Amino acid sequence: GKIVEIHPTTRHEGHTKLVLKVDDEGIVEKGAYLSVTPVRGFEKFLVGKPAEFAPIAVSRFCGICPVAHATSAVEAIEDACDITPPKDGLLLRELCGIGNKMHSHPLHQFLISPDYVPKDDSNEFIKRVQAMRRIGQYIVDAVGGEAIHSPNIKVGGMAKQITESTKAKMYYKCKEYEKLAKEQLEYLIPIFESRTLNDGTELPEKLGYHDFGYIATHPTYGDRTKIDQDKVVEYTPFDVYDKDVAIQSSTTVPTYNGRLMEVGPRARFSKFFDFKEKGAMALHIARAYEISVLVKRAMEILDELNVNGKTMSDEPIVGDGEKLGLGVHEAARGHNTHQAVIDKDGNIVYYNAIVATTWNIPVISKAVEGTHYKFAEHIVRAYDPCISCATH
Amino acid sequence: GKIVEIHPTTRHEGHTKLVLKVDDEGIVEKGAYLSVTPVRGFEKFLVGKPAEFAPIAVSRFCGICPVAHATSAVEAIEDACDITPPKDGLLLRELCGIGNKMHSHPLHQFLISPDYVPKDDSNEFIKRVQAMRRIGQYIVDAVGGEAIHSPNIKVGGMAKQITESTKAKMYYKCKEYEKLAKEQLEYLIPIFESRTLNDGTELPEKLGYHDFGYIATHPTYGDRTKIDQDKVVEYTPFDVYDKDVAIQSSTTVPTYNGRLMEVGPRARFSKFFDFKEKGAMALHIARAYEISVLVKRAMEILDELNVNGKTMSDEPIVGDGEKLGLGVHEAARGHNTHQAVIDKDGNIVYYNAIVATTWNIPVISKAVEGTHYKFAEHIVRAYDPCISCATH
Amino acid sequence: MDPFGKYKTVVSARAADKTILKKCQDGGIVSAAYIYGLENGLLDGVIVADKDDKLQTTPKVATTVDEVLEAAGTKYTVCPTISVIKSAVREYGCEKLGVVGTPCQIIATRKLMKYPIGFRHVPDKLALIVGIFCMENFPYNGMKTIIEEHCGIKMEDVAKTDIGKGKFWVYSKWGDVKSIKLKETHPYEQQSCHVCMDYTAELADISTGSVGSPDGWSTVFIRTAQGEEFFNKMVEAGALEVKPIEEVKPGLGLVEKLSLTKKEKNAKEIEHRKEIGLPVPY
Amino acid sequence: MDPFGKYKTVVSARAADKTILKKCQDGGIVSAAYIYGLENGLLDGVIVADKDDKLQTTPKVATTVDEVLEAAGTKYTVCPTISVIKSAVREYGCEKLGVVGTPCQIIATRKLMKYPIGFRHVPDKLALIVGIFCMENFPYNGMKTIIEEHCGIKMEDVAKTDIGKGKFWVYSKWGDVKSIKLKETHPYEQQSCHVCMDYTAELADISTGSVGSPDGWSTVFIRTAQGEEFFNKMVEAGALEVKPIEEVKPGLGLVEKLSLTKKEKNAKEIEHRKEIGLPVPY
Amino acid sequence: VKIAHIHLCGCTGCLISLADTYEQLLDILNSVELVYALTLVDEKTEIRETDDKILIEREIPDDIDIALVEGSVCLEDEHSMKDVFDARRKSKIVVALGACAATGGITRFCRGGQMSKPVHSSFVPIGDLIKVDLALPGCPPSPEALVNLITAALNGDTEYLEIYAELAKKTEACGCDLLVNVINKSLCMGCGSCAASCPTRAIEMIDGKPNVLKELCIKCGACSLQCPRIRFPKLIEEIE
Amino acid sequence: VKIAHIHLCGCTGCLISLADTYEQLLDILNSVELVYALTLVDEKTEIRETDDKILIEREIPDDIDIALVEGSVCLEDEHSMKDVFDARRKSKIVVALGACAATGGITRFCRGGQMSKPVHSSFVPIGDLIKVDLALPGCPPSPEALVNLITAALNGDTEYLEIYAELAKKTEACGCDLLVNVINKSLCMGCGSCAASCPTRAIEMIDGKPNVLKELCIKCGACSLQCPRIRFPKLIEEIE
Ligand SMILES: Cc1cc2nc3c(=O)[nH]c(=O)nc-3n(C[C@H](O)[C@H](O)[C@H](O)COP(=O)(O)OP(=O)(O)OC[C@H]3O[C@@H](n4cnc5c(N)ncnc54)[C@H](O)[C@@H]3O)c2cc1C
Ligand SMILES: Cc1cc2nc3c(=O)[nH]c(=O)nc-3n(C[C@H](O)[C@H](O)[C@H](O)COP(=O)(O)OP(=O)(O)OC[C@H]3O[C@@H](n4cnc5c(N)ncnc54)[C@H](O)[C@@H]3O)c2cc1C
Ligand code: NFU
Ligand code: NFU
Ligand code: SF4
Ligand code: SF4
Ligand code: SF4
Ligand code: SF4
Ligand code: SF4
Ligand code: SF4
Ligand code: SF4
Ligand code: SF4
Ligand SMILES: [Cl-]
Ligand SMILES: [Fe+3]
Ligand SMILES: [Fe+3]
Ligand code: NA
Ligand code: NA
């Protein structure tokens, strides 16, 4: 019968707090994971601003996944204005998203390496991570114009064509990345499967179990037709936390058919690759296997791409001031949603974002229950939470 | 055998210089009237800027006639984008143009009153001018939002509807303006017809004669179909002045079919009201009579106006990046031309302005020849030159 | 420090119009003054804070009595009433304009009248400047959290809110009355209100509030000659029921206490900001 | 006052390619450097200033020999060559970029290499920075007035322009050659050039120009190790014809005179700007 | 008092705003001596006659008390540069009349290249070159704000003019002043008076806060001048 | 040397930019001691046990040599305010890492009203509250720019850091800096390097001059920092 508060949690992005009610043996009885980051309030300040500013602004949700928000932003505005991006722009947009995730998953494995990677292997492990991230960031730089906040992701497609030279360079680097991925996967999967931390502590078998479903519209990009957004309702922290904790939470509470949902690699691997494992370790494992899926798709996109095909649509950014445009994207951390209303002048009338980690925060709160509070952060990190992302 | 330079000229807007070659009896042999105002360069800095900024920006050409430039700007961008302003927005826009001219003509009469109005009549004369300007400025305030630089003049029509109350007020004030105008006209026309200044100086009968034609597209508003803009070519000061004067000139030299043309009230009164008189006094006279034409037309617009009718088009500002939109407006000082190319995003690709006094400056240069240099400035003022306008 | 600013007389007052009393927040002084001016040609347009179904506010140039009655009642969220002050005198063509506002908005009005840089032909058209008392305002989603999450009532179901007796009050359309301690509302208040030094709208022609007078009645400060004329005309016309503030409970002493409390608390914040280098009005 | 900045050697030089000499402004050093590097994998992209039929400049990332040849020749108007330096290494994918520009643009390039705040992964991909000498530049419409109104030649009809022997030269496509005294061009020059303290592009790897060398040859400053390695590779390959600047007329003394004249004239402008309060680089 | 209107790179709209005191312009012009204003008076005429040239020049007179200087200075125009220093040399009080003179306003966007003076590309408020004693922002400042300034100058109302004397030290203006000085600093209380002050309607109140449509802002300074959370001198509290 | 990364109201992109030194990040982290960074290390952990609560806090340690402070400060958030003063208290050298910390950046546009903290509306660069020793603009500053700063900090290259020590006194930035400080001042020679510097491609070179798409400007200060007509220290003239 004690309250355990861990604050801030560490080795994820952003500023959160774990508020736990534990029993006399330390087992979490009631869990609360919550963002306490200030709300910069992008959705609100975007009202009154031109549509072209939306991908630029929302990129600054997060410097780890900026591509995911620019992509969801333009997909929302394109849906609002019935703009079709051309075939090769859409290929380059998905490539740029994949490049971001190709840096994010290794980065996360780098953040959890203090718990899972033996000290003696740390330097070689981090070198491999940074080599993989170097390639993923090169793809975002080349196609998006900048690795961290890509101005080439625009309403209408992608701003700039690459050259056959650049295309061939990204293909070569993807092949190398694939080799590093095979090395990384063969090393980490046995560790995750051992359920043992690098100090030898064994993790509970039921670590991070929960009863919630998953949302994933696509394995590598996004598909607004695979979700009924009318069934998505955002509730308040008071609906999931105690009053004293709810008033500290900075995020909304996304539900689907009134239910919390998990997003991210395991949700994707569940929907598309018949991955059925529950628990926190399965999250790390799905994320690890997803690195291979991404680089395979990136090369596939490059084989498909016509570097001379048009990448920007010629259609103007003209809305009717009513349609709630939907833009979904499978961010590194999960199903990421932007919505926008656009008027005839292309200005933003209404803007909304339901970010991947916004879904997972209330899931994490439940997932940490039933095991010792000493394992709670390890469950948190399995979800690769991004809190500036979730808060925006 | 002497050069006469008068610098600056006065009792007109902006910064000009008279450079005259006179014979031994003081008769001007070669005339040069030229703006030496710095070129603020609106046409150049408008490139790359959004269309909606153009009526705002070009308004600052001149604080006496800003309505003329906003009107031409929006009419040009409308032409470029095939936007049609709704009936009542167009009526309010023309009313705003007329109210501006209803302030400008009395203002010019105030500026010339030192030369034509007896000292003893000055105060009463000025009070009548200001009473008339107050009514003219009220119309532009009420309909354009500000009397000096009207933000309501916008691509698509007019931003704000007026109330029946506001409409009824302007009608009452126009009736009062018409009373003042009859008083002003009956006082000023005999003076102008007497060819005598208020110091007894008799003016030559052929004062300000020239051989050039006129351009006027409408008596109160503007009609881009009444001019073939392909025949309008802008030349340099070197094509009309000696080298040492030409380098000082800040304006371009507008021609129609290779020839200089006069614009302004006399041009309009010659095209539409069978006014055939040459010379400078016929300019003062046409300007004086146009005051009645204007207020009569304002009341006729108010009688036609539907205060509840749409004033802004719902059409977006979308161009093809190629069409050179044409916007013409009969400013107080004459035919005023703005041109614009607009891309699919509503941004200004190219922008040009041929302002009323830009036409008139090289005409004034020839008009001052043949009479004594002591009359050159009176010929200048007869054209009501606006130089910040002409230079932009 | 001084509690009320400059005034000619403070009274407790109430509109005589029964209709106004059904719709207003307190005595109905603002609606009574607006409706009286409109009906008697002393005002040809009045600025009001309106609301929608969810209590979101929109500033508006009202020209009819019905518009004044639809805007009656307090919305405890920010409504930029001054934002329409030029539209009112331009396309609306008002020459006898009534303005309502919280002290800060009243302050903004006196400032634009003194230094009318962007207010060509506005100042000479302001006929009556009505100030309402104000302790603090809130962003809409702040007040939405207070009502929906702390009072458990949907914004659509709100018929009226109020502040008094130490509590925030929600009156449901369906009969319920929920109150919470005001300390629960403080985390949601617009933090720029914490430098505000004006409680009773000290620069208005007429300032009116609820504190100091009983329920259904208003505490009214008559400050300026323009307010004194307007108010007397209303009184002579029978449009207001008036009682001396000395004859009413809890009286002027509560207003004094609350005003000096705001001034003292916010002077501390002003000094704290100056101490840490943040800008403060001067 | 130092005249040339830092350098290893100064030569007179010329391209050995007859085609370059047909199209280039002087010795064809810039084209020869670019073409040699592209042809030998020393460079995979080069920034050039291109012109249209009216001599309007456009900065561009050239990747072929034909594109370098089409950009040969001086355009005496402002071309923002550095504005494409990021595109060059992003979507163009250049890892061995050649840069050319007037001294000011070379100054800009050295600065973005030293303080690359907005130049992620740009500095290491600059393989050769080539400076051209510069006394002053012109807005397009100023040079248009010089050519059309002082030299009587249409911009369409201009095949080449030049500055030398105290005059500005227009070579028409139809055979005519018109010259005017340089004092006639000064009213039209970009006035921000009047604070420029760099004549021979003192911060380039290789700096090349016309003064000091005879017609068809260039004065070349070899400044950095990168430039030295590049220039020597071209010489050992027979890409360049080289003569000692001592053995050539008018020689380095004319370069010293013009360089010091620019620095002396423009230091006075800098001090004049400081004197009246105008900002100056520091 | 001797007053003069100096027209630099402006549009004359500020003078027109003064003219829009209407019949009261005669009261203003009767309370002072308009000694110089090319638009209104033929001053100060000086005739120099050689054997081959008659030069009739209208010069800025000496001993000006109050110079209403309108427009910005073009650095590439010698006469523009000469005029702004001339006005300063010859005037006791220099008033930056309007945003062009006070902060540069619309002319901040000038970048040159237009005929027939393509090198005219650099425009600065007059305070970047000369000492300014009072600055009136806006585009144009209202007739009422001009009346009040002239009345205060003539009556020695130093207190009223302090805000404009303080502005005279400010040569940059932008809608971002509301963000950087009010909204960002927990001072904006959502009165909306800034939005009502904007001549271009660039400011839109959304959810109780100003949104600045930056591409519509002409850097006029009206909004920052209005905001009572920036300047609120005690004299505003004085009511009937 | 003991360095820390303080993450205020940032996006962590500046830290990612430091991570995008890729393998060389091990050389950076081996040349210093990373004593604090919530994203990277479990520091500084302190456990407080009472009868009813176990509080596990990761605090900012004392005796920080170089604080890499990223993000702006939310005036309405008490923890944000506490962290920025704590960072200054505990660090000998405070580096405003990135536009958000240096000049507000994208958070300049925050105006509040968003769940679940609708009163969060006022974001300021850290220098509006604490003394900043060095500011790195850009959104984010390049990895190369960061390497050079850290190297100069560690090696005592005062001359190299002077431009950033000067920026530290500047808490506002805008694309209009190019206008106000270069184009308007007859200093712009049209190199176009500002355009290449911009992360949002808000700058367009038109007829040799920068055109700033102001609604695309996120106020990062990268253009202003690059422009050699503003700052050009002699150290740039050194070549090899
Ligand atoms: C945020 C806020 C805080 C307040 N705090 C206090 C307080 O601490 N003590 C106190 O005695 N009184 C306070 N008041 C005033 C009180 O709530 C009543 O509004 C006031 O007494 C006038 O009531 P009435 O019956 O006389 O007028 P009514 O006839 O009910 O009309 C009220 C008028 O106020 C206007 N209005 C409504 N909401 C707003 C708004 N958000 N902003 C601007 N104008 C608005 C409407 O246009 C309406 O015309 C506050 C008001 C507000 C908006
Ligand atoms: C505005 C200006 C002023 C100059 N003043 C002088 C001077 O006073 N003294 C002197 O000795 N030399 C001067 N030069 C340089 C000279 O004109 C030649 O360009 C130089 O000698 C290089 O010629 P080249 O035959 O070696 O190379 P080329 O093979 O002819 O190619 C020249 C290269 O310069 C680039 N270029 C062309 N125009 C421009 C431009 N406007 N901006 C940037 N790059 C451009 C082209 O991309 C091309 O690749 C000036 C050049 C310019 C643009
Ligand atoms: N991946 C990821 Fe983000 Ni920083 C999260 N959570 C975004 O959509
Ligand atoms: N009338 C007029 Fe203007 Ni001031 C001139 N010339 C405009 O179009
Ligand atoms: S407390 Fe002051 S600042 Fe806040 S709303 Fe009330 S009057 Fe305005
Ligand atoms: S003179 Fe200097 S500033 Fe002008 S173009 Fe040449 S190098 Fe650039
Ligand atoms: S501030 Fe505005 S009204 Fe005044 S001169 Fe300048 S452009 Fe004209
Ligand atoms: S005037 Fe000032 S306080 Fe009022 S809304 Fe504008 S910025 Fe906020
Ligand atoms: S926002 Fe409006 S009032 Fe403020 S400076 Fe810009 S144009 Fe002027
Ligand atoms: S400066 Fe840019 S990249 Fe850095 S924290 Fe702020 S938003 Fe993120
Ligand atoms: S970087 Fe060059 S082009 Fe940009 S403002 Fe500075 S001088 Fe002009
Ligand atoms: S223009 Fe570009 S580089 Fe300059 S501050 Fe704005 S976003 Fe940053
Ligand atoms: Cl841990
Ligand atoms: Fe959200
Ligand atoms: Fe023109
Ligand atoms: Na000329
Ligand atoms: Na505070």
Coordinates of all heavy atoms in Angstrom, one line a residue, chain A residues 110-137:
Chain A
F110 N 18.8 2.2 -29.6 CA 19.9 2.8 -28.9 C 19.5 3.3 -27.5 O 20.3 3.2 -26.6 CB 20.4 4.0 -29.8 CG 21.2 5.0 -29.1 CD1 22.5 4.7 -28.7 CD2 20.7 6.3 -28.9 CE1 23.3 5.7 -28.1 CE2 21.5 7.3 -28.3 CZ 22.8 7.0 -27.9
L111 N 18.3 3.9 -27.4 CA 17.8 4.4 -26.1 C 17.6 3.3 -25.1 O 17.8 3.5 -23.9 CB 16.5 5.2 -26.3 CG 16.6 6.4 -27.3 CD1 15.2 7.1 -27.3 CD2 17.7 7.4 -26.8
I112 N 17.1 2.1 -25.5 CA 16.9 1.0 -24.6 C 18.2 0.2 -24.4 O 18.2 -0.7 -23.5 CB 15.8 0.1 -25.1 CG1 16.2 -0.5 -26.4 CG2 14.5 0.9 -25.1 CD1 15.1 -1.5 -27.0
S113 N 19.2 0.4 -25.1 CA 20.4 -0.4 -25.0 C 21.0 -0.4 -23.6 O 21.6 -1.5 -23.2 CB 21.5 0.1 -26.1 OG 22.1 1.3 -25.7
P114 N 20.9 0.6 -22.8 CA 21.4 0.5 -21.4 C 20.7 -0.7 -20.6 O 21.3 -1.2 -19.6 CB 21.1 1.8 -20.7 CG 21.2 2.8 -21.9 CD 20.6 2.0 -23.1
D115 N 19.5 -1.1 -21.0 CA 18.8 -2.1 -20.3 C 19.1 -3.5 -20.9 O 19.1 -4.5 -20.1 CB 17.3 -1.9 -20.3 CG 17.0 -0.5 -19.8 OD1 17.4 -0.1 -18.7 OD2 16.3 0.2 -20.6
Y116 N 19.3 -3.6 -22.2 CA 19.3 -4.9 -22.9 C 20.7 -5.2 -23.5 O 20.9 -6.4 -23.6 CB 18.3 -4.9 -24.0 CG 16.9 -4.7 -23.5 CD1 16.2 -3.5 -23.6 CD2 16.2 -5.8 -23.0 CE1 15.0 -3.3 -23.1 CE2 14.9 -5.6 -22.5 CZ 14.3 -4.4 -22.5 OH 13.0 -4.2 -22.1
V117 N 21.5 -4.3 -23.8 CA 22.8 -4.6 -24.5 C 23.9 -4.6 -23.5 O 24.0 -3.7 -22.7 CB 23.1 -3.5 -25.6 CG1 24.4 -3.7 -26.2 CG2 22.0 -3.5 -26.6
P118 N 24.6 -5.7 -23.4 CA 25.7 -5.8 -22.4 C 26.7 -4.7 -22.7 O 26.9 -4.2 -23.8 CB 26.4 -7.2 -22.7 CG 25.2 -8.0 -23.3 CD 24.4 -7.0 -24.1
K119 N 27.3 -4.2 -21.6 CA 28.2 -3.0 -21.6 C 29.3 -3.2 -22.6 O 29.6 -2.4 -23.4 CB 28.8 -2.7 -20.2 CG 29.2 -1.3 -20.0 CD 30.1 -1.1 -18.8 CE 30.2 0.4 -18.4 NZ 31.1 0.5 -17.2
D120 N 29.9 -4.4 -22.6 CA 31.0 -4.7 -23.5 C 30.6 -4.6 -25.0 O 31.5 -4.3 -25.8 CB 31.5 -6.1 -23.2 CG 32.4 -6.2 -22.0 OD1 32.9 -5.1 -21.6 OD2 32.5 -7.3 -21.4
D121 N 29.3 -4.9 -25.3 CA 28.8 -4.7 -26.7 C 28.3 -3.4 -27.0 O 27.9 -3.1 -28.1 CB 27.7 -5.8 -26.9 CG 28.2 -7.2 -26.7 OD1 29.4 -7.4 -26.6 OD2 27.3 -8.1 -26.7
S122 N 28.4 -2.4 -26.1 CA 27.6 -1.2 -26.2 C 28.2 -0.4 -27.4 O 27.4 0.1 -28.3 CB 27.7 -0.4 -24.9 OG 27.2 0.9 -25.2
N123 N 29.5 -0.2 -27.4 CA 30.1 0.7 -28.5 C 29.8 0.1 -29.8 O 29.4 0.8 -30.8 CB 31.6 0.8 -28.2 CG 31.9 1.7 -27.0 OD1 31.2 2.7 -26.8 ND2 33.0 1.4 -26.3
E124 N 30.1 -1.2 -30.0 CA 29.8 -1.8 -31.3 C 28.3 -1.7 -31.7 O 27.9 -1.5 -32.8 CB 30.2 -3.2 -31.4 CG 30.0 -3.9 -32.7 CD 30.8 -5.1 -33.0 OE1 32.1 -5.0 -32.9 OE2 30.3 -6.2 -33.4
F125 N 27.4 -1.8 -30.7 CA 26.0 -1.7 -30.9 C 25.6 -0.3 -31.3 O 24.9 -0.1 -32.3 CB 25.2 -2.1 -29.6 CG 23.7 -2.1 -29.8 CD1 23.1 -3.2 -30.3 CD2 23.0 -0.9 -29.5 CE1 21.7 -3.1 -30.4 CE2 21.7 -0.9 -29.6 CZ 21.0 -2.0 -30.1
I126 N 26.2 0.7 -30.7 CA 25.8 2.1 -31.0 C 26.4 2.5 -32.4 O 25.7 3.2 -33.1 CB 26.3 3.0 -29.9 CG1 25.5 2.8 -28.6 CG2 26.2 4.5 -30.3 CD1 26.2 3.4 -27.4
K127 N 27.6 2.0 -32.7 CA 28.1 2.3 -34.0 C 27.2 1.7 -35.1 O 26.9 2.4 -36.1 CB 29.5 1.7 -34.1 CG 30.6 2.6 -33.7 CD 31.9 1.9 -33.3 CE 33.1 2.9 -33.2 NZ 34.0 2.5 -32.1
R128 N 26.7 0.5 -34.9 CA 25.8 -0.1 -35.9 C 24.5 0.7 -36.0 O 24.0 1.0 -37.1 CB 25.5 -1.5 -35.6 CG 24.7 -2.3 -36.6 CD 24.1 -3.6 -36.1 NE 25.2 -4.5 -35.7 CZ 25.3 -5.0 -34.5 NH1 24.4 -4.7 -33.5 NH2 26.4 -5.8 -34.2
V129 N 24.0 1.2 -34.8 CA 22.8 2.0 -34.8 C 23.0 3.3 -35.6 O 22.2 3.7 -36.5 CB 22.3 2.3 -33.4 CG1 21.4 3.6 -33.3 CG2 21.6 1.1 -32.8
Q130 N 24.1 4.0 -35.3 CA 24.4 5.2 -35.9 C 24.6 5.1 -37.4 O 24.3 6.0 -38.2 CB 25.6 5.9 -35.3 CG 25.2 6.4 -33.8 CD 24.3 7.6 -33.8 OE1 23.2 7.6 -34.2 NE2 24.8 8.7 -33.3
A131 N 25.2 3.9 -37.9 CA 25.4 3.7 -39.3 C 24.0 3.5 -39.9 O 23.8 4.0 -41.1 CB 26.2 2.4 -39.5
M132 N 23.1 2.8 -39.3 CA 21.8 2.6 -39.8 C 21.0 4.0 -39.9 O 20.3 4.3 -40.9 CB 21.0 1.6 -39.0 CG 21.6 0.2 -39.1 SD 20.8 -0.9 -37.9 CE 19.2 -1.2 -38.8
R133 N 21.1 4.8 -38.8 CA 20.5 6.1 -38.8 C 21.0 7.0 -39.8 O 20.3 7.8 -40.5 CB 20.6 6.7 -37.4 CG 19.6 6.1 -36.4 CD 19.2 7.2 -35.4 NE 20.3 8.1 -35.2 CZ 20.3 9.4 -35.5 NH1 19.2 10.0 -35.9 NH2 21.4 10.1 -35.3
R134 N 22.3 6.9 -40.1 CA 23.0 7.8 -41.1 C 22.3 7.5 -42.4 O 22.1 8.5 -43.2 CB 24.5 7.5 -41.1 CG 25.2 8.5 -42.0 CD 26.6 8.1 -42.2 NE 27.6 8.4 -41.2 CZ 28.3 9.5 -41.1 NH1 28.2 10.4 -42.1 NH2 29.1 9.8 -40.1
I135 N 22.0 6.3 -42.7 CA 21.4 6.0 -44.0 C 19.9 6.5 -44.0 O 19.5 7.1 -45.0 CB 21.5 4.5 -44.3 CG1 22.9 4.1 -44.6 CG2 20.6 4.1 -45.5 CD1 23.2 2.7 -44.4
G136 N 19.2 6.2 -43.0 CA 17.8 6.6 -42.9 C 17.7 8.1 -43.0 O 16.8 8.7 -43.7
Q137 N 18.6 8.9 -42.3 CA 18.5 10.3 -42.4 C 18.9 10.8 -43.8 O 18.4 11.9 -44.3 CB 19.4 11.0 -41.3 CG 19.0 10.6 -39.9 CD 17.6 11.3 -39.5 OE1 16.6 10.9 -40.0 NE2 17.7 12.3 -38.6

